[PDB]
């Protein structure tokens, strides 16, 4: 299949792993947290065979530079964190930190996680040029400063919504 569950899908710690992570980050179910953990497991296993080799080895030098360079492009790993084992140290909470649904809240603009999830899926808030409607987007470090409502959105610089105008039309009929 696409995503892989762990070998046993009920533990004492696992049942509140889904409870804590979904309740604070607005996750829908176990599916996408397991998907990111699937991606992080590929990254951390790729972090292994980088690091079982030595310094001035042709494998550790080239994509070892690249692997930290890719994550500083997406903003998961910090700029000064150019260590080859800090990619082992990062956990599943920092990918969920970089999620756009949680990024909409954390920049302001939302007042809650679920109101951000509503604002994401109601085709409201744009990333620079293009307006996106996915909760999990992996907003990069460079593109994070251009998270704003779309110009064709009522919270932005457009007309008000169809029920505020209808309420304005209904009180106009009362006048």
């Amino acid at each position: 299949k696409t995503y892989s569950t762990p070998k046993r899908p009920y533990e004492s710690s696992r049942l509140d792993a889904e409870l804590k992570l979904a309740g604070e980050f607005g996750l829908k179910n176990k599916k996408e947290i397991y998907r990111i953990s699937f991606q992080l497991s590929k990254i951390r296993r790729a972090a292994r065979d980088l690091l079982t080799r030595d310094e001035k080895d042709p494998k550790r030098l080239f994509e070892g530079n690249a692997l930290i360079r890719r994550l500083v492009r997406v903003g998961v790993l910090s700029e000064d964190k150019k260590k080859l084992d800090y990619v082992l140290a990062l956990k599943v909470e920092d990918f969920l930190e970089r999620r756009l649904q949680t990024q909409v809240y954390k920049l302001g603009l939302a007042k809650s996680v679920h109101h951000a999830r509503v604002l994401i899926t109601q085709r409201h808030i744009a990333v620079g040029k293009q307006i996106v409607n996915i909760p999990s987007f992996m907003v990069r470090l460079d593109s994070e400063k251009h998270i704003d409502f779309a110009p064709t959105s009522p919270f932005g610089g457009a007309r008000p919504g169809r029920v505020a105008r209808r309420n304005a039309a209904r009180k106009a009929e009362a006048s």
Partner: protein, 102 residues
């Protein structure tokens, strides 16, 4: 300087398809130069689109994440044949290295 794309212009479907991969850029400017030179389009026939879109997008769901590829480190193609000691025609005598550092 590397001619990077804009912030919002990279993404493909607002969602499921990835942000952008550099291989996807390299194919895109090649086919649009083919558009801008030979002045004709090309269709979306299901014989090619069964592979040229589907497993391309299924790879792009799991390899390029956040605009950056990550599945290529988990691949197992060995990187020594294209490299060793920066090229071929390397060592038979002592003179081939003698005029290299000279």
């Amino acid at each position: 300087p590397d001619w990077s794309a804009s912030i919002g212009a990279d993404i493909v479907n607002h969602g499921r398809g990835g942000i952008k991969s550099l291989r996807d850029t390299e194919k895109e400017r090649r086919v649009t130069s083919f558009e801008e030179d030979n002045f004709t389009r090309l269709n979306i026939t299901n014989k090619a689109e069964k592979r040229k879109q589907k497993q391309r997008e299924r790879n792009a769901r799991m390899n390029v994440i956040g605009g950056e590829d990550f599945g290529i480190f988990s691949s197992k193609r060995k990187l020594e044949d294209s490299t060793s000691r920066r090229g071929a025609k390397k060592t038979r005598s002592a003179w081939d290295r003698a005029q290299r550092r000279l």
